[PDB]
Design a protein around this ligand. Sequence first.
Ligand SMILES: CCCCCCCCCCCCCCCCCC(=O)OC[C@H](COP(=O)(O)OCCN)OC(=O)CCCCCCCCCCCCCCCCC
Ligand code: SF4
Ligand code: SF4
Ligand SMILES: [Zn+2]
Lengths: 376, 90, 208, 57, 114, 111, 71, 176, 45
Amino acid sequence: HPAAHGVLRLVMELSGEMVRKCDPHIGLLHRGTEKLIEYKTYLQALPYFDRLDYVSMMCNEQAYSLAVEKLLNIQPPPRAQWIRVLFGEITRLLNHIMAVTTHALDIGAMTPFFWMFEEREKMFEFYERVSGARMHAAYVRPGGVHQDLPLGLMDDIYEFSKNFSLRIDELEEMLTNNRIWRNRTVDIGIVTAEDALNYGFSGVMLRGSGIQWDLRKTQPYDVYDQVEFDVPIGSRGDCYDRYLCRVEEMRQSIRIISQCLNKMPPGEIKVDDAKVSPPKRAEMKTSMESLIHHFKLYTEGYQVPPGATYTAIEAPKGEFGVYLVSDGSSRPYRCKIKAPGFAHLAGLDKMSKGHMLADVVAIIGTQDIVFGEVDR
Amino acid sequence: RFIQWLRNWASGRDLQAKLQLRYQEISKRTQPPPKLPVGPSHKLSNNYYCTRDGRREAMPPSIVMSSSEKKAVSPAPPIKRWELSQDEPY
Amino acid sequence: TRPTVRPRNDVAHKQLSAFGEYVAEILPKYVQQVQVSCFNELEICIHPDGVIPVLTFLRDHSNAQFKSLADLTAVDIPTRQNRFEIVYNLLSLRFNSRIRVKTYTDELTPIESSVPVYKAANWYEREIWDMFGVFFANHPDLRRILTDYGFEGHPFRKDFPLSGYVELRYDDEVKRVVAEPVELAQEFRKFDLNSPWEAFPAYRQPPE
Amino acid sequence: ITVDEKLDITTITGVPEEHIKTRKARIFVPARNNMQSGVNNTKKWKMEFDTRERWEN
Amino acid sequence: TSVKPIFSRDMNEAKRRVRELYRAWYREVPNTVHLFQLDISVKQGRDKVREMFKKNAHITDPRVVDLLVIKGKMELEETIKVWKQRTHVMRFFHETEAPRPKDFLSKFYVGHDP
Amino acid sequence: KKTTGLVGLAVCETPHERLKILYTKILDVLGHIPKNAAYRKYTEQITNEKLSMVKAEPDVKKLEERLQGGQIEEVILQAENELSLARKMIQWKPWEPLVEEPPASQWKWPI
Amino acid sequence: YRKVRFVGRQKEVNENFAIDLIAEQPVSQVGSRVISCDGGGGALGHPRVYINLDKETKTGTCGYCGLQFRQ
Amino acid sequence: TYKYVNLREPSMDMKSVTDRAAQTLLWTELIRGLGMTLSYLFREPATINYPFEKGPLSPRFRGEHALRRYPSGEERCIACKLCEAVCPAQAITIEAEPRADGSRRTTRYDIDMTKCIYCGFCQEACPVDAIVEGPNFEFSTETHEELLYNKEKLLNNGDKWEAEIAANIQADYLYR
Amino acid sequence: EDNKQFFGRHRWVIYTTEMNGKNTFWDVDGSMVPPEWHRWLHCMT
Ligand SMILES: CCCCCCCCCCCCCCCCCC(=O)OC[C@H](COP(=O)(O)OCCN)OC(=O)CCCCCCCCCCCCCCCCC
Ligand code: SF4
Ligand code: SF4
Ligand SMILES: [Zn+2]
C-alpha cells in the first residue's frame, strides 16, 4: 500500500529496531524512453514529455517548449506567455494539493483526502475545456499555446479562485496544530548540512531548510518578471518545516492567478513566422503557400540548427532539466531528462539512519517522490 | 432553523462559498461566434521575409583554444540578499 | 526583426568570455579547449586526466564557487574514434552561472570517480555503467540500476536495435515466466524524413 | 602510471548472440533519390545490413 | 596501447583471477539449489559454471580479461543473496526453446536463407 | 546573533580576528608555490584586497557589505576551504604545460 | 482456410457502398469556362481548386470532390 | 523576497502558560477541529448517480473514431497518407489503390485502439477534413481479438451518430 | 430535466424496456441513449 502512486521495492537491514540501513531498488518503471526519442520528430514526440509524471502536466512541456524556442532563436507572442503563467501556476495547485494529502494518507487520516478531491476535480474541467482531455493534455508546443481558449473560463477562473482560500483553511485547522500530527512530524529526517546542498537538491528540502535560492526570480522564464510574490522559507531542516512551505506556497499562487487575470493583452497565440507554426484552417484551405508549409510541416519537422543546450525550470516538487543535443536536422539526438528522484531519493539512506522503521514511511512523503519520472 | 446554524457552529461560517457549486452562478455555454484576430506582421506591401528571420543564426562564438591585471573577474556580480517582504513575514 | 525573434542580451556574453578566459590560464596541465555558446553558456574541453582535479578547483575558491552539481550525463558518438563522452554540469550558487565540463573517453580506458568531490555522483555513476558501458573505478559501489537483471547489452548505445533481443512470455507448461526470442506483430515501420538542399549556410561544413 | 604498451587487434565478444558471424553488413554512399535534384542527402557513409524474410501475419 | 589497465597487468594476475572466483562459484552452486526451492541435479549446476568459464577462450588481452571479471564478480552478489526470484536464474538453462537444426539439410526444409 | 541564518551552522564566536588568522594563514602557506603560475597572482590578490576591508570597522554587520560572502559566520567557511585546495595544489602540478592534445580532430560538432 | 474466424460472429460489413454512389447526382452545368469547386460548404471541404470544362461534353469534378460536374 | 515560518517564541508568562496548560491537559485543542470540522457532515453529498445521470464535457473532447462523408456519400477520406505520418504511436495503417472510376480511395484502414495514445494529432492533420475523434466513450469489449478496427467497422461507428459530430465542429472550428 | 437547481446531477434520464433485441429491464448499461442526446445529456451543450 505505501507505494505513493508508484512502484518500488526497498530493502533495509535494521538493527533490531532502528533501520540504520536502506538501499532501495528503483527501476521498476523504466519503459525505455530516451532510446525512443531519438526515433521521433520534434512535434510528434512531444507527449512523451507529458506522460512522464502524472500530476504536473502543463509544467512539463513548459520545460521542453522552452528548450526548443532557444535553439530556434524565437519567442512566443505576448498573449502566449500570459497563458503559460495561468496554467503554469495553476498546476502548482495540483502537486501541492497532492503532496499534503496523499502523503498524509500514509499517516492514516481519511478526510483530508475525501475532503479535497471533491475540489481537485473542479480544476480538471479547466484542462478539458481549454483543450481536450482528462489529464495529459498536449497544449504548449514549440510555438506557444496551441489554440485559443473559449469564450468563458475567465468567469470560471475568477469565480473558482475566490472560493478557494477557504478549502486550504480546512487543511489547516485539520492539520497544523493537531497534536497527534505535530508529533508524527517534528525534528524527523533532519538534513540541515551543506550536504543538503552538496547532493545538489532542487527546491523544497532547500528553501524550507534555510539556504535561500529559487529559479523563478533569479532567472526569468516567460513573462514571470512582472508579477510580485514572496518565497516562503523554513526555520529548521526537519519535515514539519518542509510541510509548512507547501501551505504558504498554496497561498502565494492565488496571488498570481489573481494578479494574472488582469493583465492578459489581446494578441495572437502561435509564433507568427509560420515556418514553425502551422497556419489556421482558413488559410491552409485557400491560398497556395499554406500547404507547402502545412504539408511539409506534418511530415518532417522544423529544421532546428545544430548545437547543444540545457535548461531548467521550477517544477512543483523541484527542478526539471532537458539537455537537448540536436544534430542539425529534423530528428533529435540525445534528449536527456533529469527530474528530482535522482536527488531527493539519493538522500534517503543518508537521511534516515538512527530513526525507527515507522518513520521511514513518513520520510519519503516529504520529498514528493513520484516514479516513472525516475525514467531519468 | 436548528440545522442551519449547527453547520455554522463550526469552521467559522461560510454559507457563501460552498463546496458543490451545483446551484446557479456558473457560465452557460458558448453562445457567440468568436473571431480570432491575426496581428503580428500579417499584412502585405511591407512584411518581407529576411527581415523577420527567426532562424539562421551563427555557430557558437569561440574563445582562445589550443593549436593581465585581472581582478579575479567573477562570472557576474554576487547576489544581493532579499528583503523580509512585509506581508506577515513572521 | 524584433517582434517574433528572441531579443538577445550582451552583458551576459561579455563576462563569461572573461571568467572563462583564465581557467585556461591557471590549469593548463589539463584544459585543452574552451568556448562560449551563443546563448551565454560555457563548455570546457578537458583531457580525461583532470576530472577529480579540475572540479576540486571548481569545488572551492573565492572567485568560482560551483558547489551545486546538477546534471551528469553522456553522449555516444561513433566516428569519433573515442566513442563516448561525459558532460558534467555545475551551478555556482553565488555567481549565478552554468559552466559545463566535457571529457571524452573510450570503453576500455577507465575514468576515475568524482564521488569524494561531490556525493551526488553516487547514483549518476551507477547508472552509466549499466547503459553505455563506461567503467568508473574506485567507486564505493557499482551495480545495476534502471535495467533488469538480464540485459547483457548495455542498451542506450547506438548498436542496440530498439526492441531488445528477447521478448518475454509466460507459459503454463511448467510454472515460470520464460524468455523466447523477439517476434513482433508489426514491422516498426522505418520512415525517411531527411530532406535535401542544406538549409543552413552558417554551419556549412568545410569545403573539401 | 602503468602505461604497458601492447598490440592486440581490438575485438569484443558476447554482447549480441549469434548475429556476430551469421550476417554481412555493408558500407555504401546513398545514391540520391532521383525524383528530385537535391544533392544534400549524400556525404555520409552509412551502413545497413542484409534483409531477411518478412512474411505475412 | 597506453591507457591504464584496470586491475591486472599482464595475463597472470589476470589468469590468477579467473581461477579464483571460479571457486566462489564452484563452492557455491548448491546452497541456492536448496534455497530457491528449485530442483535440478546439483551436478548440472557444476557443469554450467564450468561450461561458461571455458567459453570465452581466445581473449588475447588484459583490460578485456579484467572487463569480463567485473561482470563476473558482480553476479555472486545477487545470486549468493536473493535478489532473483527463481526466474532470473533458471533462464540460464533453456528448457522451452525448441532446438535449432545447426546442420545443413535440416535447414533446407524449414526457413529461408539463414 | 543567535540564529546562524542558513541552517546547519552555529555562531562561535569571535569575529574580526577569526578571519585574520586564516587570510594570514593563507598568505604564508600560499607563498611556497613556485612563482610562475598565476595561481598565486590570483589566489593571494583576492585575500589581500579582502583583508583591507577587514581592518577595520564595526559592527560585524557593516563588515558584510563590500565583502560579498553570505553571513560572516559563513564567510569563514568560505575562507576555510580555499586553503584545503592550496595545500593540495603542490601535490598535483597544474602549472606544468599541456599534456596529450586530443587526436587532432575530435571536437567538431556536426560530425 | 481463413474463413473459420467469424463463424457465429456475424461479420460486420458496410451496408451502403460508395464504390459508385456518385452517379445519381444531377451533374451540374454553369455556362462559363472555369469554376470554383470548394465543396460541402465554405471552409469545410476540399481546398479550393479551379477546373476547366472545355471539351465538348465531360466536365471534371476535381477528384477530391467526386461529385459529377460539367457543363 | 522572503518570509519566515515556524519562527516564533513562547511568551513565558503565567497569563500564557495556563493557556498552554489548559490545552495539553484538558484537550481544549484537538476537539476544536475533529470535534467539529468533521461534523460538518450536514452538507448535501456530491454524487453523479451514474447509470442515469452523467457529467459535463466540452465540444473539444476526444474518443472513439469515425469517418464522415459529405452529403451523398463520398467516403470523405482521399488517402493522402498524412493522418498516418504524424501519428506518434503509429497506430494508423493505410493502403490506397486506384478505384474503378479513377478517383482514388482506400482499401485497408486500420486504427489499432490499443496503441492509439489519443493525441489529437490525427484530427488536425487531415486537409480534406475526414477523420474525426468522436465524443462517445462506448468501448470495453471482452476480447483483444476485437479492438483492432478495419475500415468498414469505422464508417458505421461514424455513421451511427453524425448528429453528434456534425454539430460539434461548427461550434469549435472558428477557434482553430 | 431538473429546474436548473443543481449542477451535474440536474440533467437525468430514464430507461424502460427491451430497446433492440434486449433483456428486459434490470439490465441497464448506458450505451443505449439515442445518438442525439450526447449533445444534451452530457452537458456538452
Ligand atoms: C481536586 C480534584 C482533582 C482536580 C484535577 C484537575 C484536572 C485534572 C484531570 C486531568 C486529567 C485528564 C485526562 C488526563 C490528561 C490527558 C492525557 C494526557 O496527559 O495526554 C498527554 C499527551 C502527551 O502529549 P505530549 O506530552 O505533548 O507529547 C507529544 C509531543 N509531540 O498529550 C495529548 O494531548 C494526548 C491526547 C490524547 C491522546 C489520544 C487522543 C485521541 C482522540 C481521542 C479523544 C476522545 C476522548 C474524548 C473523551 C470522550 C468522553 C466520553
Ligand atoms: S483523412 Fe486526411 S489523412 Fe486520414 S487519410 Fe483521408 S486524407 Fe489522408
Ligand atoms: S489518435 Fe492519437 S494516436 Fe491514434 S492515430 Fe490519431 S494521433 Fe496517432
Ligand atoms: Zn469539389
